[PDB]
C-alpha cells in the first residue's frame, strides 16, 4: 500500500477541469519541492504528466496542470479528451533517499 | 568594534571591508619575502557545500 | 534514437530467485540513473530501487533490502534486478525506467523524474 493517499477515480465528460488530492506530510511532501505525477493507460507503460511540482515535459500538453499546497499537491487536468481517460499516480521524494507513489486514480470521460 | 576570529590560509572570510581603492599593504617590497596583504573593497561572494 | 529494452515475459516456480535484465539502448549507459518498478499485474505501482553505472552503487527500498541487489556489466550494456526468496506475493509486471542525470556535484539519485520505460516481463509464479 502507498504511504500517499490519492483518490481512486473522478469521472465526468470532455472540456472539464479536474483536482485530484495527492496527500503526504511533512517528510514527504512538505519539505522537499520533489512531487510528480504519472499517467497510466489500462495495460500501458506509465507516462511522465508532471514533474517537479509542475513543469510539463515535451508532449504534455496545457490540458494538464498542478500545483503544491502544504501537505497535499494535486493534478489539475483542463480541457479533458476521452483520450485521456487513463490512471494517474503521484509520485514523491519521502527522504533518506526513497522515491513512493500513490493512488489509482482512473479518469472517465463519457 | 567587530573582530571576527575566523582563519583561513589565502584568502580572507567574512571580514571588513575597506573605504575605498582596493588598498595594498605590505612591511617591505625589498624583502619579497614579506606576506603582501590586499584588501578589497567589493566582495566577492563563495558558496561551498558537502553533498553528502 | 534511444530506447530502453528489457527481457520479455518470464516463467518460474515460487522461491526461485529471478534475474530481470534491463537493455539500455542508444544513450551512454553511463550518464543517467536507473530505476526499477513493480507492477502487480493490473495495479499500482510499487517502487524497488535503483543502480548508478558509472559508480556501481545501489540501494533498494527498505521494504527488500537483504533481498534485491542490482547489478550490471557495461561491455554488454546491461542492468540486472536479481530477487531472491521469491514469494508468489511478488506476482508483478517489472519494469526499467530512465532517472536523473548524473554529476559528480549535485545529486539526482531520489529525484522522481523517470523520462522513458522499458517494455517489461511479467513474472509467471504460484
Ligand atoms: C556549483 O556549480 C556547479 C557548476 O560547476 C553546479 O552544478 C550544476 O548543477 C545544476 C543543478 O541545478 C545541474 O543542472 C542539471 O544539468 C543537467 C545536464 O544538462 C546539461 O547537459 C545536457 C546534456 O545533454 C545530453 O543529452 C542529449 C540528449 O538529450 C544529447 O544529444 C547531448 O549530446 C548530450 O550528450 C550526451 O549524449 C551524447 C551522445 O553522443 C554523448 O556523447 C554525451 O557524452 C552525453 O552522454 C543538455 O541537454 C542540457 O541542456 C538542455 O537542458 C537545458 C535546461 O532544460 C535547456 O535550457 C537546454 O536548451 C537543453 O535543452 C545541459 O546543457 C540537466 O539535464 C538538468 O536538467 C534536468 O533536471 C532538472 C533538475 O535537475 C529539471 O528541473 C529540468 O527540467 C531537466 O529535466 C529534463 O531532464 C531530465 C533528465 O535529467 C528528465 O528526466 C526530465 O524529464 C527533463 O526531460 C527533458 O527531455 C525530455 C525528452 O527526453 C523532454 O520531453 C522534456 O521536456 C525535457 O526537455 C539540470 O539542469 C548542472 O548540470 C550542474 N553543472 C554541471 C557542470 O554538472 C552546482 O549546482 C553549484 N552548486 C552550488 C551549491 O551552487
Ligand atoms: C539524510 O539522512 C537523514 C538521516 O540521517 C534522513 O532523515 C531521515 O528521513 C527519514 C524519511 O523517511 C525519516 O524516517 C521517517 O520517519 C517518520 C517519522 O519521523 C521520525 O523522525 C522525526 C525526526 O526525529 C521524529 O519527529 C518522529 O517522531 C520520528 O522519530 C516515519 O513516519 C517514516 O516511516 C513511516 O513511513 C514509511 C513509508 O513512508 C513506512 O515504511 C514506515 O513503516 C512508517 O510507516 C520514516 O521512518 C528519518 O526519521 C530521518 N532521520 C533523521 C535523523 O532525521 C534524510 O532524509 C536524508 N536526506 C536528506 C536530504 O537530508
Not at chain 1, 494538464?64 to 499516480?89: V, W
Not at chain 3, 511478488?90 to 520505460?117: E, H, K, Q
Amino acid at each position: 500500500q502507498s504511504a500517499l493517499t490519492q483518490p481512486a477515480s473522478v469521472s465526468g465528460s470532455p472540456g472539464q477541469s479536474i483536482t485530484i488530492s495527492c496527500t503526504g506530510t511533512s517528510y514527504d511532501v512538505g519539505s522537499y519541492n520533489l512531487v510528480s505525477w504519472y499517467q497510466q493507460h489500462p495495460g500501458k507503460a506509465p507516462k511522465l504528466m508532471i514533474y517537479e511540482v509542475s513543469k510539463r515535459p515535451s508532449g504534455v500538453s496545457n490540458r494538464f496542470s498542478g500545483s503544491k499546497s502544504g501537505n497535499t499537491a494535486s493534478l489539475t487536468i483542463s480541457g479533458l479528451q476521452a483520450e485521456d481517460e487513463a490512471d494517474y499516480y503521484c509520485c514523491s521524494y519521502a527522504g533518506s533517499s526513497t522515491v513512493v507513489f500513490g493512488g489509482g486514480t482512473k479518469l472517465t470521460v463519457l | 568594534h567587530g573582530i571576527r576570529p575566523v582563519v583561513s590560509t589565502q584568502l580572507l572570510l567574512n571580514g571588513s571591508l575597506a573605504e575605498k581603492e582596493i588598498v595594498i599593504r605590505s612591511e617591505n617590497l625589498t624583502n619579497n619575502a614579506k606576506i603582501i596583504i590586499v584588501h578589497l573593497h567589493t566582495p566577492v561572494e563563495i558558496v561551498c557545500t558537502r553533498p553528502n | 534514437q534511444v530506447q530502453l529494452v528489457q527481457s520479455g515475459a518470464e516463467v518460474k516456480k515460487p522461491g526461485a530467485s529471478v534475474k530481470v535484465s534491463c537493455k539500455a539502448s542508444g544513450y551512454t549507459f553511463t550518464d543517467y540513473y536507473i530505476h526499477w518498478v513493480r507492477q502487480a499485474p493490473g495495479q499500482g505501482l510499487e517502487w524497488m530501487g535503483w543502480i548508478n553505472p558509472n559508480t556501481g552503487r545501489t540501494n533498494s527500498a527498505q521494504k527488500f533490502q537483504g533481498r534485491v541487489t542490482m547489478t550490471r556489466d557495461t561491455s554488454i550494456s546491461t542492468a540486472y534486478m536479481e530477487l531472491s526468496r521469491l514469494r508468489s506475493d511478488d506476482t508483478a509486471v517489472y519494469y526499467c525506467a530512465r532517472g536523473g542525470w548524473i554529476g559528480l556535484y549535485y545529486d539526482s539519485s531520489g529525484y522522481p523524474n523517470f523520462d522513458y520505460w522499458g517494455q517489461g516481463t511479467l513474472v509467471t509464479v504460484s
